[PDB]
């Protein structure tokens with residue numbers, strides 16, 4: 001009655017004034033500000049390593065904090081930990097349930113985090129006296145399938161599940177320390193910050209929201225998309241972030257002001273983004289696609305500057321190493337490739 | 341009634357978010373491109389790397 | 399070739415050997431997905447004296463020489479579109495439909511007579527882009543209740559176009575042809591039909607026959623002799 | 625040298641004292657070179673079609689490519705032999721005369737061995753059922769090498785032994801300077817290969833029928849067996865019905881004596897019929913399969 005109609009009319013005026021404030025502060029575009037700078041030349045990249053040994057599709061990959069070791073996760077039920085510079089393997093951890101979609105490497109190189117469609121999470125330990133791998137925790141309590149999970153510290157982890165929620169957990173306690181809710185679809189990916197302390201996430205309700213890690217409530221919301229958000233990445237500076245989608249329109253947003261800056265798109269692409277990663281300068285914005293190749297795009301000019309077509313099936317995971325000397329791509333054809 | 345609580349917490353979120361400050365997109369992009377230009381000297385991805393400094397080389 | 403490099407190569411060789419050894423035993427197990435509505439009797443089939451071993455609840459059983467593996471994906475309330483591409487190499491998709499629910503109103507939503515939304519679900523799962531060469535083996539649920547109810551209840555409420563008699567045979571055949579007429583891919587995939595029987599041996603033998611027919615067809619297509 | 629060749633041809637009677645001008649003026653030659661050019665065309669389109677698609681990489685496709693390459697070599701061998709047939713009773717050394725026939729025999733044996741290898745591989749794959757179908761490269765390499773080596777050895781054997789250059793009584797009439805024992809060995813090999821192929825295909829069909837009909841007794845509302853039978857009868861009918869004439873001609877040659885049978889001077893038609901059969905393999909081996917014709921329609 002009066003309560004409900006007053007409440008949503010007040011929400012209407014609040015939304016209108018928020019949109020007015022968003023429009024007022026926008027005076028130009030990144031293209032206008034950077035209309036005088038040399039375009040990046042044609043980028044040539046060649047495969048240097050052809051890591052093989054998986055017998056199913058590849059769904060995730062995460063670089064270590066040393067640029068020496070990788071992690072994969074196939075549907076065969078394996079969590080091979082590769083070792084670059086040699087192509088040899090160092091671990092062949094077998095999973096319990098062969099339904100995995102996430103990976104995580106600890107920043108100190110001690111533990112590995114895994115989790116898929118079985119509604120639980122696992123933390124395997126590497127540095128042990130036995131010289132093997134043993135499950136130390138089996139964090140459970142979610143309702144939907146886990147979409148992503150990235151380490152926050154050596155004793156703190158954060159996860160996002162398909163029941164419109166995220167959870168900041170606590171290892172060695174097995175308790176959901178913090179809960180984040182508000183989404184209406186399902187959180188498909190999230191990214192951390194260079195200094196942590198904040199994290200952004202995206203769902204299938206055509207939205208992208210930022211969350212603090214202490215008080216536990218959404219700060220702002222960034223709409224604009226017309227499709228699902230199944231990929232996200234954070235700028236190294238910490239004041240902007242990219243966003244993929246299933247309709248091949250990469251977006252670049254701003255934390256300081258909720259604005260639309262870039263609209264990365266073309267006319268010969270009708271597929272969907274799968275992964276997005278930045279570089280130290282934040283100039284070469286890599287991206288994945290369903291049309292069997294990865295197209296690296298310049299961020300400032302918002303135009304194509306190279307194609308990494310070397311795969312057979314859809315690319316599913318993509319990653320830039322920490323210091324930066326190569327990138328890793330993994331598709332459904334059971335092949336990991338190292339471009340440089 | 342769950343709907344009234346949903347609406348009231350939604351409007352509380354909206355009004356508490358409305359108090360955030362806003363910045364000029366032009367100067368934000370200026371700092372963005374300044375950082376991009378500054379932290380690009382080595383950048384072994386876009387800058388060509390010598391063969392002797394290429395670990396991923398046989 | 400130093401000592402540590404040789405040790406690393408030996409470790410990699412052992413890891414690869416073990417992985418290849420373990421990857422062959424998993425290539426001889428037939429995977430069968432299971433689907434069905436809420437009150438579609440998915441609990442009784444997995445309890446029907448055959449299964450030995452939230453989210454996925456994988457079940458293992460063995461018949462003759464084949465080692466089957468059944469995934470009961472029923473605990474998920476999220477969108478089926480974002481995780482259905484994982485099940486792409488499945489050999490078959492068992493489907494259960496409740497025959498004794500042609501008149502009861504669907505829960506929490508009026509109408510659809512507990513069968514119309516079942517036909518929409520079957521249409522959505524059959525005419526998919528990932529399932530183009532997978533059988534749609536279909537089990538028809540409780541029939542004793544169906545035959546005792548149809549003897550004294552009207553059928554035209556769910557299908558107001560049927561002028562036939564109220565006998566068991568004609569009604570069952572009409573339901574079978576209605577469910578079998580939604581297969582748009584008439585040349586690639588085939589749908590089998592079976593009325594649920596109390597005996598476990600009948601159902602298990604039907605599943606075995608269907609999967610061995612699928613294996614024969616797959617081998618014929620692989621050899622190029624099809 | 626030249627005297628031996630002319631003496632052998634005079635003894636056989638094929639010299640005919642050829643006094644025709646250098647011009648070919650033969651309609652048979654032109655129609656046959658157009659036919660073999662068509663064969664080469666079909667083979668080269670098959671080779672490009674199988675090469676372009678990345679999906680076509682299974683060992684079945686490798687055997688098909690082997691057969692296509694063998695047919696391509698056979699067509700070139702036939703056209704080379706035909707273009708040089710005019711100056712056969714003069715202007716030729718025994719070495720080149722033997723080389724022509726050796727190349728011809730290698731080209732006409734490689735295709736038969738490729739068909740045998742394809743049948744063996746199909747029987748092996750169909751004998752045991754697997755959920756995921758694959759093959760070890762060892763067996764593929766072994767077969768694809770052994771067929772070529774045995775064909776080359778069979779072709780190159782006459783160049784040194786069984787050359788009939790000394791004996792004037794054991795030389796055949798269709799092909800002078802050839803001992804009949806080599807012809808008998810070749811025809812025994814051919815009939816053994818035919819028997820093996822027929823037995824293998826019959827066993828495949830019988831296994832499929834027995835496994836399908838008896839084991840499965842589901843409800844009712846067998847096309848696989850009918851399609852398999854149709855394919856088997858088509859391939860066997862083509863193969864025997866268009867390799868029989870050369871078999872019969874070789875048997876008639878080894879049976880008749882010199883200056884006894886006045887029919888053998890017609891081998892060109894039987895040879896071109898055999899080459900036509902070898903050429904029309906891709907039609908059968910791509911028309912039956914749905915996917916190959918779909919890809920061809922796409923291309």
Ligand SMILES: Cc1cc(-c2nc3cnc(Oc4cccc(Cl)c4)nc3o2)cc(C)c1OCC(=O)O
Pocket residue numbers: 705709712724725728729732733736798799810811813814891892895
């Ligand atoms: C030039 C020429 C060649 C041939 C000829 N080429 C053959 C190749 N193979 C076989 O037997 C096979 C064939 C295939 C597989 C096996 Cl296992 C044995 N018979 C052949 O006959 C015949 C005549 C009349 C010729 O013309 C006479 C001239 O030179 O003037």
